[PDB]
PDB file of C-alpha atoms in Angstrom:
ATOM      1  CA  UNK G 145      80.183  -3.235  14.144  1.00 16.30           C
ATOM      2  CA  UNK G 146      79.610  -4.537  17.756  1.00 16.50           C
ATOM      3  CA  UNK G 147      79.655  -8.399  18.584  1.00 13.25           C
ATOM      4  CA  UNK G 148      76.943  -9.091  21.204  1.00 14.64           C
ATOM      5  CA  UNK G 149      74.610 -10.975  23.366  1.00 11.75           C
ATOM      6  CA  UNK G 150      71.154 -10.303  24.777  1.00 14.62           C
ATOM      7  CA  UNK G 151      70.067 -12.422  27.650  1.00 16.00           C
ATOM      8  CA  UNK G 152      66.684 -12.119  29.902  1.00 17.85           C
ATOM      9  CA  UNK G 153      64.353 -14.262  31.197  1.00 15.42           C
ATOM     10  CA  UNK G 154      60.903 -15.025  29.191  1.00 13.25           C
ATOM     11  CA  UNK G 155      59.178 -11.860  29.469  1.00 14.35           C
ATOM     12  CA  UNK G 156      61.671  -9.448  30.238  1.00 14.94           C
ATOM     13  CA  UNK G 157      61.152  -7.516  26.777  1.00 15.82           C
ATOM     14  CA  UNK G 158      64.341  -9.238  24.982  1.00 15.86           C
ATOM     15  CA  UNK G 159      62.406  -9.277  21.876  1.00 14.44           C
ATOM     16  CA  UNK G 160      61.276  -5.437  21.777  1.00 13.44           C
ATOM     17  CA  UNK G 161      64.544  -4.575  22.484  1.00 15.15           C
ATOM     18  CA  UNK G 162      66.618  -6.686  20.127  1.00 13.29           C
ATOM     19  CA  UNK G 163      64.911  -4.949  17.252  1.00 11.53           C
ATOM     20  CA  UNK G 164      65.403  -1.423  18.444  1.00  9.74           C
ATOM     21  CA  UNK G 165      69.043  -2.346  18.927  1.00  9.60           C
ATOM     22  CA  UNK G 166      68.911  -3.482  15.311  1.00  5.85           C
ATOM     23  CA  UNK G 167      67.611  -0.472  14.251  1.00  4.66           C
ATOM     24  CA  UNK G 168      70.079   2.042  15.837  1.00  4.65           C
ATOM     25  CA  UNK G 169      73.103  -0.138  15.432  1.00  4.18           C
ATOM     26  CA  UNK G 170      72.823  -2.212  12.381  1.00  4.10           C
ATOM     27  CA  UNK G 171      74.298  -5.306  13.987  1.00  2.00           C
ATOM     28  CA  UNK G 172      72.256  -8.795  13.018  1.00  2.00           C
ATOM     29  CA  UNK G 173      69.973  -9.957  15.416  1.00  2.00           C
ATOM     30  CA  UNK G 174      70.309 -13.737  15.795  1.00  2.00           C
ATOM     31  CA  UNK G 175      67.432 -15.724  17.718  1.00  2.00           C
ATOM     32  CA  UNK G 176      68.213 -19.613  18.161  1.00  2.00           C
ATOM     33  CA  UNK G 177      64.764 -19.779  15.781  1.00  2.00           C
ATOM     34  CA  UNK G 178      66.250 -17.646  13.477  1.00  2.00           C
ATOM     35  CA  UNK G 179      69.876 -19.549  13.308  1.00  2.00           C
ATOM     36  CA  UNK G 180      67.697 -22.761  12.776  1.00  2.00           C
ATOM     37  CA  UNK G 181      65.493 -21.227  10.048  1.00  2.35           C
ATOM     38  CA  UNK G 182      68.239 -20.334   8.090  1.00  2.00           C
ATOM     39  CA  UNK G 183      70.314 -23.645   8.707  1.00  4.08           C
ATOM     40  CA  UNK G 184      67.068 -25.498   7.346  1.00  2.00           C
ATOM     41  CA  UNK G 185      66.323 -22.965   4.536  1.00  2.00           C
ATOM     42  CA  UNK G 186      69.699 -23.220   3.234  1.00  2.00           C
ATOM     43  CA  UNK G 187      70.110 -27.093   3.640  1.00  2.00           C
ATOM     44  CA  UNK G 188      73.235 -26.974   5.190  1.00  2.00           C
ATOM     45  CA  UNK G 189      74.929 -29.740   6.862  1.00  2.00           C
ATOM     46  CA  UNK G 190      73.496 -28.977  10.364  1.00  2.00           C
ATOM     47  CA  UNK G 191      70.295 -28.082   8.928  1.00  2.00           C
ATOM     48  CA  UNK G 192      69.470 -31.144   7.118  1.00  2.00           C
ATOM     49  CA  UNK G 193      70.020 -32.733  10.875  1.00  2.00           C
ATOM     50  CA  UNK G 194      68.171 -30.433  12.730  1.00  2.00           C
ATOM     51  CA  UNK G 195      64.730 -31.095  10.469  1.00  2.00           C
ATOM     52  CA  UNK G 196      65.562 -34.780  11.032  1.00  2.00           C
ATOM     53  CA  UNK G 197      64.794 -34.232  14.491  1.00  2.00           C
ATOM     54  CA  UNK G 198      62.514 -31.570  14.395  1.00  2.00           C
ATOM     55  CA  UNK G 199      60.249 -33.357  12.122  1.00  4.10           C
ATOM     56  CA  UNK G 200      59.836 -36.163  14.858  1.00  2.00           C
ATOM     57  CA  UNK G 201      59.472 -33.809  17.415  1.00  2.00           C
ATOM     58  CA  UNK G 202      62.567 -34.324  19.125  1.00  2.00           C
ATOM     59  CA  UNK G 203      64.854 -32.169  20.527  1.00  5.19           C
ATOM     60  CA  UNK G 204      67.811 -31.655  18.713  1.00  5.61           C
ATOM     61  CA  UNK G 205      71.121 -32.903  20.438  1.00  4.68           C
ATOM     62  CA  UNK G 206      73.937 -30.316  21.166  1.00  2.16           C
ATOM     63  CA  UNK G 207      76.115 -30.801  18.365  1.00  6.31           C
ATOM     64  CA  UNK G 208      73.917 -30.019  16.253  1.00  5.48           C
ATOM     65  CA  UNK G 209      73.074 -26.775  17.673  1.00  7.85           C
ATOM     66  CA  UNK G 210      76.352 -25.683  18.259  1.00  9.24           C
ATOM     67  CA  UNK G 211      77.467 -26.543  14.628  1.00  9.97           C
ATOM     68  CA  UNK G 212      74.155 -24.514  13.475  1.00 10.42           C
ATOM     69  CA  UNK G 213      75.775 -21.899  15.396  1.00 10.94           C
ATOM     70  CA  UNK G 214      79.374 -22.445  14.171  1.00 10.23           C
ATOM     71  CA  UNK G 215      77.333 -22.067  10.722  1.00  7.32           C
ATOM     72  CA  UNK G 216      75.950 -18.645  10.995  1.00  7.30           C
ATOM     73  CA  UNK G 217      78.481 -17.185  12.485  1.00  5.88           C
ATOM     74  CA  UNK G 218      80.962 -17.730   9.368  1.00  3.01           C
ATOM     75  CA  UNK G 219      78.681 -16.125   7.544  1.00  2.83           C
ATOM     76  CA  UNK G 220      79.592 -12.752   5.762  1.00  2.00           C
ATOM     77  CA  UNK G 221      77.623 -10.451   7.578  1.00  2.00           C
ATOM     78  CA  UNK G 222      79.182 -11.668  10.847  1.00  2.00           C
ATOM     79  CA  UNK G 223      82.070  -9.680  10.298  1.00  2.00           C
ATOM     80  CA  UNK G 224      80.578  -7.003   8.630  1.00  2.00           C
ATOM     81  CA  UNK G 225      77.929  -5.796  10.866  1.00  2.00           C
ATOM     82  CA  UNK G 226      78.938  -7.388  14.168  1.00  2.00           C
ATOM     83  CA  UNK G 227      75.770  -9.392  15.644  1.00  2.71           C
ATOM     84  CA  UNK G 228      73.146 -10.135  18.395  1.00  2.61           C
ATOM     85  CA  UNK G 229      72.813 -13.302  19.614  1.00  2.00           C
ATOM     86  CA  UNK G 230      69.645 -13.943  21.259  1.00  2.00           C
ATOM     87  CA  UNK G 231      68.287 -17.345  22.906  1.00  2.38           C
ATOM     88  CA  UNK G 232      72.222 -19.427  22.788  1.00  2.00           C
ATOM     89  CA  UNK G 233      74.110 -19.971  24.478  1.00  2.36           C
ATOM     90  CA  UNK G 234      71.028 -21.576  26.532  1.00  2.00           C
ATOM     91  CA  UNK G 235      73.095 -23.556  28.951  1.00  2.00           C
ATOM     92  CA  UNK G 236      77.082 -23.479  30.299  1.00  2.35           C
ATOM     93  CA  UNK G 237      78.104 -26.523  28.027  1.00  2.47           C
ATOM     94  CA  UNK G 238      76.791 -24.366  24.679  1.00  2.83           C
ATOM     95  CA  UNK G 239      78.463 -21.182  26.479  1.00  2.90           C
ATOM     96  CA  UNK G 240      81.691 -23.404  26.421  1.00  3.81           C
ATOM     97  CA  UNK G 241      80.959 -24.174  22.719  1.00  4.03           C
ATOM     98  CA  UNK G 242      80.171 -21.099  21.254  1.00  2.00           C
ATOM     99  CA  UNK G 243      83.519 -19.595  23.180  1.00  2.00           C
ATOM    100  CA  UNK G 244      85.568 -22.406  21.127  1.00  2.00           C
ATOM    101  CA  UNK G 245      83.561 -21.253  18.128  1.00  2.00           C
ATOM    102  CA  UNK G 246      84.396 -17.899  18.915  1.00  2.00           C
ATOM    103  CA  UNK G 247      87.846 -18.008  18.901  1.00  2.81           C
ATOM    104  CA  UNK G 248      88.309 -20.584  16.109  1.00  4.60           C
ATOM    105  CA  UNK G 249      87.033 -17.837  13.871  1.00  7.30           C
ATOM    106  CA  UNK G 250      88.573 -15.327  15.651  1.00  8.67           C
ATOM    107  CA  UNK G 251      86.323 -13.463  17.215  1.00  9.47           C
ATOM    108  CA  UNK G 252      85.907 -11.411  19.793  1.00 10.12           C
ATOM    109  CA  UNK G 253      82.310 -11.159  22.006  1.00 10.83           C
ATOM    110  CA  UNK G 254      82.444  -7.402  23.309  1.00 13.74           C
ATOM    111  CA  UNK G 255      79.451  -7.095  25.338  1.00 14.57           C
ATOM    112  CA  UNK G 256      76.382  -8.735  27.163  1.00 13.61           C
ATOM    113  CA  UNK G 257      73.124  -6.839  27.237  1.00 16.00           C
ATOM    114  CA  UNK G 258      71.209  -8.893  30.248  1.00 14.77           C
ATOM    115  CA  UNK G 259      67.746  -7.541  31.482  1.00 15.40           C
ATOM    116  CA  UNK G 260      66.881  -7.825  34.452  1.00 16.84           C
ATOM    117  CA  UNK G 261      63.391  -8.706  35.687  1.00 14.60           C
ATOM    118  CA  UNK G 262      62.620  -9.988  38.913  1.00 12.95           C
ATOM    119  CA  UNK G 263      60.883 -13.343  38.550  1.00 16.33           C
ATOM    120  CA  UNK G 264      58.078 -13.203  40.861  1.00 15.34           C
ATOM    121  CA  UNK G 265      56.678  -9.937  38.800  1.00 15.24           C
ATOM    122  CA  UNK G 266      57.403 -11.976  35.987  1.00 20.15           C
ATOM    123  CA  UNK G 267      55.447 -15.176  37.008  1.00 22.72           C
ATOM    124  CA  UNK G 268      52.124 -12.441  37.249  1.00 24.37           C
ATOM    125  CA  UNK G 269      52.717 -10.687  33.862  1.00 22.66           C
ATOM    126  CA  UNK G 270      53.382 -14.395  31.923  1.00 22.86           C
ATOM    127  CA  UNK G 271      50.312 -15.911  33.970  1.00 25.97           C
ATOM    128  CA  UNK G 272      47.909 -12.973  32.945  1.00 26.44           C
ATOM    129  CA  UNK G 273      46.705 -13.903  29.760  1.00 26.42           C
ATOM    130  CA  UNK G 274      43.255 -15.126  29.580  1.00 26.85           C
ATOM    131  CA  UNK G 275      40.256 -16.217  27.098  1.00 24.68           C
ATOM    132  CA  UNK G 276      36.648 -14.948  27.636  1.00 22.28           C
ATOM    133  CA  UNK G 277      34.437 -18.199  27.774  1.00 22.18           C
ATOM    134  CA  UNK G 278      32.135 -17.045  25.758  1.00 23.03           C
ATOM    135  CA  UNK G 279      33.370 -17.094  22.486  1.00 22.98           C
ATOM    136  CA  UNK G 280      35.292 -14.062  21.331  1.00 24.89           C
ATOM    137  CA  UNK G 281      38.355 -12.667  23.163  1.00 25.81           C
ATOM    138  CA  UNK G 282      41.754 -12.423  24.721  1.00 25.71           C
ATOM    139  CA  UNK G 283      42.383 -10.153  27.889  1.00 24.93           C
ATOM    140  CA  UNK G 284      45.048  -9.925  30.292  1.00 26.42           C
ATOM    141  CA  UNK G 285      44.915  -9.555  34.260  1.00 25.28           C
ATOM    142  CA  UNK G 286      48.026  -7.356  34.134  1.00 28.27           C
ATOM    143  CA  UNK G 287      48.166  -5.400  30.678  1.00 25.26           C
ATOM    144  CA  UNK G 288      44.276  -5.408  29.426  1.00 27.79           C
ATOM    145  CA  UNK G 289      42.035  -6.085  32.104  1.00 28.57           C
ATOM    146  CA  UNK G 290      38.356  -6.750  30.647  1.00 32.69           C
ATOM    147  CA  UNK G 291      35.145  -4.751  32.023  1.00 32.44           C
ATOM    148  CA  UNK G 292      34.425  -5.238  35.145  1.00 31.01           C
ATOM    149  CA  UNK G 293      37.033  -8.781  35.496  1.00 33.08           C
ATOM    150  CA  UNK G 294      35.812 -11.900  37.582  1.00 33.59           C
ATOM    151  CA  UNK G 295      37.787 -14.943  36.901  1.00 32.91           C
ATOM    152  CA  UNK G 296      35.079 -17.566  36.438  1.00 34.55           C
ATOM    153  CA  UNK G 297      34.085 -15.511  32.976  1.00 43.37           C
ATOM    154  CA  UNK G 298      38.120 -16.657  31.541  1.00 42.55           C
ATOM    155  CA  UNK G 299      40.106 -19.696  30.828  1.00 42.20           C
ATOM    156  CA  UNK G 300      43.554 -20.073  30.018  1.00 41.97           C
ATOM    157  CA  UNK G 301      45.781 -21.684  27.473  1.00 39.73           C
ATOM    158  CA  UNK G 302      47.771 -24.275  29.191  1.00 41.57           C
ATOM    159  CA  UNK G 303      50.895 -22.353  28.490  1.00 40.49           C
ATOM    160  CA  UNK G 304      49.964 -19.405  30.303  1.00 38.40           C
ATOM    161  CA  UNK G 305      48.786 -20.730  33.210  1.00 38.66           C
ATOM    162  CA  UNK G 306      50.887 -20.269  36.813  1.00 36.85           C
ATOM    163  CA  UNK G 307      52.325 -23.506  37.198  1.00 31.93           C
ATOM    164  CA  UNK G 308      53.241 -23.661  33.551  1.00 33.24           C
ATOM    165  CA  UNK G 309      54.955 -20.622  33.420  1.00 32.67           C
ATOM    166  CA  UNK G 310      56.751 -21.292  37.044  1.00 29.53           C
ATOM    167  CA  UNK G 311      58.366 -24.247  35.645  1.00 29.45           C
ATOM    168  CA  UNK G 312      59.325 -22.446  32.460  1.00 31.22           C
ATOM    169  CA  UNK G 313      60.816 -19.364  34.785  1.00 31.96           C
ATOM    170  CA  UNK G 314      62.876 -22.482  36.659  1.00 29.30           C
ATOM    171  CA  UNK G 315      64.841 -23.846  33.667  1.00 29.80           C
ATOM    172  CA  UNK G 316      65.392 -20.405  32.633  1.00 30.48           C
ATOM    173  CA  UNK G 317      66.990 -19.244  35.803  1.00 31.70           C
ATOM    174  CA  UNK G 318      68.825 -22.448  36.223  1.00 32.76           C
ATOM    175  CA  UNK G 319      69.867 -22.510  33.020  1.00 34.78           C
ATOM    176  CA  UNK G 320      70.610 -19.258  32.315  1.00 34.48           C
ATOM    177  CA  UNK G 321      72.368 -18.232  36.102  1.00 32.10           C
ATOM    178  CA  UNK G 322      75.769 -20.055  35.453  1.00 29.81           C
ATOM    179  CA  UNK G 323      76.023 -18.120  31.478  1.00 30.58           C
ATOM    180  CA  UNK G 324      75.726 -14.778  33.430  1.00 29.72           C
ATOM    181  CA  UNK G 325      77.897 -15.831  35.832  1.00 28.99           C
ATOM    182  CA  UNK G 326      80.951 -17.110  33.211  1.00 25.00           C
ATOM    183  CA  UNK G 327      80.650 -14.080  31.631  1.00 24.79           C
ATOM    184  CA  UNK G 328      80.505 -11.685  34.063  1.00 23.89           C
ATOM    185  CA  UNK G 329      83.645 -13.086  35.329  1.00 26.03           C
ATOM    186  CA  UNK G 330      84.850 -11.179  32.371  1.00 23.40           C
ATOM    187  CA  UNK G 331      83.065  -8.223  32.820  1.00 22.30           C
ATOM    188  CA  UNK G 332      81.050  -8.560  29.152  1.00 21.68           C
ATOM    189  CA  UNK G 333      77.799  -8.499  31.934  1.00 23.75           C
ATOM    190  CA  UNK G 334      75.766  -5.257  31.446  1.00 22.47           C
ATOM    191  CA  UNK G 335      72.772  -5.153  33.501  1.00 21.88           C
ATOM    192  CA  UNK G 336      69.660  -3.490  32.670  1.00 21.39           C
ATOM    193  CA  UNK G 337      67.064  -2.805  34.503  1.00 18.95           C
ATOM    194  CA  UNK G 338      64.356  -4.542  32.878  1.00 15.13           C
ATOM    195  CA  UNK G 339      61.964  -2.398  35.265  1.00 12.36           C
ATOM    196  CA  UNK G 340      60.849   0.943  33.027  1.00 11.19           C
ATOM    197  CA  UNK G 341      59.157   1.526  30.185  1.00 12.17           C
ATOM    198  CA  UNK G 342      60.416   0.195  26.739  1.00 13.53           C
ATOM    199  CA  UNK G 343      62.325   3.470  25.841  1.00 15.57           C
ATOM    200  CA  UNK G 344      63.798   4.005  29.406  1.00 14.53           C
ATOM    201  CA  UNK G 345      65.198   0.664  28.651  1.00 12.16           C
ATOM    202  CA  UNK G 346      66.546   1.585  25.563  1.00 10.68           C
ATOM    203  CA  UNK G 347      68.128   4.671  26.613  1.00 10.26           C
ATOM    204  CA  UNK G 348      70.011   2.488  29.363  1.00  6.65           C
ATOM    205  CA  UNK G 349      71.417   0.079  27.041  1.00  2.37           C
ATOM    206  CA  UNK G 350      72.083   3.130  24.359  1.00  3.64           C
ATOM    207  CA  UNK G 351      74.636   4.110  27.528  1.00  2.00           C
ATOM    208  CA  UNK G 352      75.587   0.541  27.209  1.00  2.00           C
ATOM    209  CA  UNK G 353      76.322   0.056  23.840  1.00  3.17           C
ATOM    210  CA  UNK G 354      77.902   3.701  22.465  1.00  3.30           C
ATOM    211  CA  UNK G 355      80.255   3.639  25.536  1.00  3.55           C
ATOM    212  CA  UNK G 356      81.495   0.245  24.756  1.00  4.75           C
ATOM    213  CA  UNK G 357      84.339   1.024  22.013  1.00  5.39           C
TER     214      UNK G 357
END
Protein backbone atom coordinates (compact mmCIF):
# COMPACT_ATOMS: atom_id res chain seq x y z
CA UNK A 1 0.00 0.00 0.00
CA UNK A 2 1.40 3.44 -1.13
CA UNK A 3 -0.65 6.77 -0.62
CA UNK A 4 -0.10 9.00 -3.69
CA UNK A 5 -0.57 11.77 -6.09
CA UNK A 6 -0.12 12.16 -9.84
CA UNK A 7 0.08 15.64 -11.16
CA UNK A 8 0.87 16.88 -14.96
CA UNK A 9 -0.36 19.23 -17.12
CA UNK A 10 -3.20 18.24 -19.86
CA UNK A 11 -1.33 16.11 -22.11
CA UNK A 12 1.52 15.03 -20.30
CA UNK A 13 0.35 11.20 -20.36
CA UNK A 14 -1.15 11.29 -16.60
CA UNK A 15 -3.82 9.07 -17.76
CA UNK A 16 -1.59 6.22 -19.48
CA UNK A 17 0.38 6.23 -16.64
CA UNK A 18 -2.07 6.15 -13.77
CA UNK A 19 -3.31 2.84 -15.06
CA UNK A 20 0.03 1.18 -15.45
CA UNK A 21 0.74 2.31 -11.91
CA UNK A 22 -2.52 0.58 -11.04
CA UNK A 23 -1.55 -2.35 -12.56
CA UNK A 24 1.92 -2.95 -10.97
CA UNK A 25 1.01 -1.56 -7.61
CA UNK A 26 -2.55 -2.23 -6.84
CA UNK A 27 -3.15 1.15 -5.26
CA UNK A 28 -6.76 2.88 -6.41
CA UNK A 29 -6.56 5.31 -8.94
CA UNK A 30 -8.78 8.28 -8.06
CA UNK A 31 -9.63 10.94 -10.91
CA UNK A 32 -11.76 14.05 -9.59
CA UNK A 33 -14.44 12.37 -12.34
CA UNK A 34 -14.14 9.29 -10.77
CA UNK A 35 -14.54 10.66 -6.93
CA UNK A 36 -17.69 12.50 -8.35
CA UNK A 37 -19.11 9.41 -10.12
CA UNK A 38 -19.07 7.51 -7.20
CA UNK A 39 -20.32 10.37 -4.78
CA UNK A 40 -23.41 10.62 -7.28
CA UNK A 41 -23.80 6.82 -7.79
CA UNK A 42 -23.91 6.21 -4.22
CA UNK A 43 -26.16 9.27 -3.26
CA UNK A 44 -24.16 10.39 -0.62
CA UNK A 45 -24.44 13.59 1.10
CA UNK A 46 -21.94 15.45 -1.19
CA UNK A 47 -23.20 13.69 -4.09
CA UNK A 48 -26.74 14.57 -3.96
CA UNK A 49 -25.12 18.36 -4.00
CA UNK A 50 -22.81 17.95 -6.58
CA UNK A 51 -25.75 16.71 -9.26
CA UNK A 52 -27.65 19.76 -7.96
CA UNK A 53 -25.15 21.77 -9.57
CA UNK A 54 -24.03 19.72 -12.19
CA UNK A 55 -27.42 19.32 -13.55
CA UNK A 56 -27.59 23.22 -14.08
CA UNK A 57 -24.36 23.32 -15.40
CA UNK A 58 -22.69 25.00 -12.72
CA UNK A 59 -19.63 24.53 -11.21
CA UNK A 60 -19.69 23.00 -8.05
CA UNK A 61 -18.45 25.22 -5.05
CA UNK A 62 -15.41 23.99 -2.95
CA UNK A 63 -17.03 22.45 -0.15
CA UNK A 64 -18.54 20.33 -1.92
CA UNK A 65 -15.61 18.99 -3.60
CA UNK A 66 -13.55 18.74 -0.77
CA UNK A 67 -16.29 16.85 1.26
CA UNK A 68 -16.61 14.47 -2.01
CA UNK A 69 -13.08 14.02 -1.33
CA UNK A 70 -13.28 13.68 2.49
CA UNK A 71 -15.93 10.92 1.24
CA UNK A 72 -13.80 8.62 -0.73
CA UNK A 73 -11.09 8.72 1.11
CA UNK A 74 -12.88 7.01 4.28
CA UNK A 75 -13.66 4.51 2.23
CA UNK A 76 -12.32 0.89 2.93
CA UNK A 77 -10.07 0.45 0.24
CA UNK A 78 -8.25 3.66 1.21
CA UNK A 79 -6.47 1.97 3.77
CA UNK A 80 -6.19 -1.16 2.25
CA UNK A 81 -4.59 -0.55 -1.00
CA UNK A 82 -3.16 2.93 -0.49
CA UNK A 83 -4.40 5.28 -3.52
CA UNK A 84 -3.78 7.64 -6.53
CA UNK A 85 -5.20 10.74 -6.58
CA UNK A 86 -5.40 12.23 -9.88
CA UNK A 87 -6.98 15.76 -10.97
CA UNK A 88 -7.38 17.30 -6.81
CA UNK A 89 -6.08 18.94 -5.29
CA UNK A 90 -6.64 21.41 -8.43
CA UNK A 91 -5.77 24.60 -6.65
CA UNK A 92 -3.69 25.63 -3.14
CA UNK A 93 -7.02 26.25 -1.13
CA UNK A 94 -8.19 22.31 -2.01
CA UNK A 95 -4.33 21.37 -1.35
CA UNK A 96 -4.99 23.03 2.14
CA UNK A 97 -8.22 20.96 2.40
CA UNK A 98 -7.34 17.71 1.44
CA UNK A 99 -4.08 18.11 3.97
CA UNK A 100 -6.81 18.75 6.87
CA UNK A 101 -8.62 15.75 5.42
CA UNK A 102 -5.57 13.95 5.48
CA UNK A 103 -4.70 14.14 8.81
CA UNK A 104 -8.21 14.04 10.32
CA UNK A 105 -8.21 10.46 9.12
CA UNK A 106 -4.87 9.98 9.78
CA UNK A 107 -3.17 9.66 6.95
CA UNK A 108 -0.14 9.99 5.62
CA UNK A 109 0.53 11.23 1.64
CA UNK A 110 4.01 9.47 0.83
CA UNK A 111 4.76 10.57 -2.55
CA UNK A 112 4.02 12.90 -5.62
CA UNK A 113 4.45 11.48 -9.09
CA UNK A 114 4.56 14.99 -11.25
CA UNK A 115 5.36 14.76 -15.08
CA UNK A 116 6.93 17.01 -16.52
CA UNK A 117 6.20 18.38 -20.00
CA UNK A 118 7.30 21.52 -21.24
CA UNK A 119 4.28 23.60 -22.25
CA UNK A 120 5.17 25.01 -25.49
CA UNK A 121 5.60 21.19 -26.92
CA UNK A 122 2.51 20.70 -25.25
CA UNK A 123 0.48 23.62 -26.81
CA UNK A 124 1.58 21.72 -30.52
CA UNK A 125 0.64 18.12 -29.50
CA UNK A 126 -3.01 19.43 -27.79
CA UNK A 127 -3.51 21.83 -30.94
CA UNK A 128 -2.88 18.93 -33.52
CA UNK A 129 -6.00 17.32 -33.80
CA UNK A 130 -7.92 17.94 -36.86
CA UNK A 131 -11.18 16.87 -39.00
CA UNK A 132 -10.95 16.21 -42.80
CA UNK A 133 -13.69 18.54 -44.40
CA UNK A 134 -14.91 16.22 -46.35
CA UNK A 135 -16.82 14.01 -44.43
CA UNK A 136 -15.00 11.11 -42.84
CA UNK A 137 -11.96 11.51 -40.55
CA UNK A 138 -9.79 12.55 -37.68
CA UNK A 139 -5.92 13.18 -38.17
CA UNK A 140 -3.40 14.80 -36.19
CA UNK A 141 -0.49 17.31 -37.26
CA UNK A 142 1.79 15.77 -34.63
CA UNK A 143 0.81 11.95 -34.05
CA UNK A 144 -1.12 10.94 -37.51
CA UNK A 145 -0.39 13.22 -40.14
CA UNK A 146 -2.86 12.54 -43.23
CA UNK A 147 -1.46 11.96 -46.96
CA UNK A 148 0.12 14.47 -48.27
CA UNK A 149 -1.32 17.33 -45.24
CA UNK A 150 -2.37 20.97 -46.34
CA UNK A 151 -4.35 22.74 -43.78
CA UNK A 152 -7.21 24.18 -45.83
CA UNK A 153 -8.43 20.25 -46.36
CA UNK A 154 -9.06 20.21 -41.97
CA UNK A 155 -11.06 21.95 -39.39
CA UNK A 156 -10.90 21.78 -35.83
CA UNK A 157 -13.11 21.23 -32.85
CA UNK A 158 -13.15 24.35 -30.88
CA UNK A 159 -11.45 22.60 -28.06
CA UNK A 160 -8.47 21.74 -29.86
CA UNK A 161 -7.73 24.68 -31.41
CA UNK A 162 -4.39 26.95 -30.28
CA UNK A 163 -5.93 29.58 -28.43
CA UNK A 164 -8.25 27.17 -26.71
CA UNK A 165 -5.80 24.97 -25.56
CA UNK A 166 -3.30 28.05 -24.53
CA UNK A 167 -5.81 29.24 -22.16
CA UNK A 168 -6.47 25.76 -20.84
CA UNK A 169 -2.38 25.25 -20.45
CA UNK A 170 -2.66 28.86 -18.36
CA UNK A 171 -5.07 27.80 -15.57
CA UNK A 172 -3.27 24.65 -15.40
CA UNK A 173 0.11 26.10 -14.77
CA UNK A 174 -1.28 28.74 -12.56
CA UNK A 175 -3.20 26.58 -10.83
CA UNK A 176 -1.26 23.80 -10.52
CA UNK A 177 2.50 25.78 -9.85
CA UNK A 178 1.77 26.75 -6.13
CA UNK A 179 0.46 22.60 -5.33
CA UNK A 180 3.97 21.57 -6.62
CA UNK A 181 5.49 24.09 -4.89
CA UNK A 182 3.69 23.27 -1.16
CA UNK A 183 4.60 20.00 -1.61
CA UNK A 184 7.84 19.99 -2.70
CA UNK A 185 8.62 21.99 0.27
CA UNK A 186 8.25 18.60 1.76
CA UNK A 187 10.07 16.74 -0.56
CA UNK A 188 6.79 14.34 -1.61
CA UNK A 189 7.81 16.13 -5.36
CA UNK A 190 9.12 13.40 -7.76
CA UNK A 191 9.75 14.66 -11.11
CA UNK A 192 9.45 12.78 -14.19
CA UNK A 193 10.44 13.48 -17.21
CA UNK A 194 7.40 13.48 -19.15
CA UNK A 195 9.81 13.53 -22.35
CA UNK A 196 10.25 9.54 -23.49
CA UNK A 197 8.25 7.08 -24.57
CA UNK A 198 5.36 5.66 -22.37
CA UNK A 199 7.52 2.76 -20.89
CA UNK A 200 10.71 4.93 -20.37
CA UNK A 201 8.31 6.84 -18.29
CA UNK A 202 7.22 4.07 -16.46
CA UNK A 203 10.47 2.66 -15.70
CA UNK A 204 11.37 6.21 -14.14
CA UNK A 205 8.55 6.35 -11.86
CA UNK A 206 9.00 2.32 -11.14
CA UNK A 207 12.52 3.94 -9.57
CA UNK A 208 10.14 6.29 -7.97
CA UNK A 209 7.74 4.31 -6.43
CA UNK A 210 9.72 0.80 -5.23
CA UNK A 211 12.42 3.08 -3.65
CA UNK A 212 9.93 5.00 -1.70
CA UNK A 213 9.39 2.63 1.51
Amino acid sequence: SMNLLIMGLPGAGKGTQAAKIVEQFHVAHISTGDMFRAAMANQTEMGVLAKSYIDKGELVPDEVTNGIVKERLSQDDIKETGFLLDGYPRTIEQAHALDKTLAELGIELEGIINIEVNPDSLLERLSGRIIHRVTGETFHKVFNPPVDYKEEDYYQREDDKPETVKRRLDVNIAQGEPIIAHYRAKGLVHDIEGNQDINDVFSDIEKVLTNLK
